Design a protein around this ligand. Structure first.
Ligand SMILES: [N+]
Lengths: 9, 140
């Protein structure tokens, strides 16, 4: 899965 | 600065991959940056340097690095204790001038991040607004 700026830390 | 040498390796390993960058790689880079927190200034400089120098296709990856580092640090150390957002904010105008030299179809991805930063108060709104204005001004 590619990085999303919506994804939690 | 061994921790910085390890961070530098992770960040430059972005060159070994075609974007979009995976969560797994972004995590690795982020974990390296956090372990190098003693030298947060060198981490910020390395990221800004990467953004200045990289090919157009790595501009958004570079911005994702800033996003991932800043949000992880806020989470791990506390929002008010985070050293990364305040440090990244110093040169942020220059950083975004460089970012906006991405391919045309990547501009919306920069704005998306900026809107999330505003929504979630990752950076102060006074800092974010001129960055958004720059996006819109480019579209005209
Ligand atoms: N921090």
């Amino acid at each position: 899965p590619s990085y999303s700026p919506t994804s939690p830390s | 600065m061994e921790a910085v040498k390890t961070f530098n390796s992770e960040l430059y390993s972005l060159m070994d991959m075609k974007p979009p960058i995976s969560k797994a790689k972004m995590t690795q880079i982020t974990k390296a940056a956090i372990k190098a927190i003693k030298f947060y200034k060198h981490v910020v400089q390395s990221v800004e340097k990467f953004i200045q120098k990289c090919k157009p296709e790595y501009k958004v990856p570079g911005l994702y690095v800033i996003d991932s580092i800043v949000r992880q640090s806020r989470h791990q150390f506390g929002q008010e204790k985070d050293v990364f957002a305040p440090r990244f904010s110093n040169n942020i105008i220059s950083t975004f001038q460089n970012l906006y030299r991405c391919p045309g179809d990547d501009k919306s991805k920069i704005v998306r991040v900026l809107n999330l930063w505003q929504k979630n108060n990752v950076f102060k709104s006074e800092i974010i607004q001129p960055l958004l204005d720059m996006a819109a001004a480019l579209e005209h």
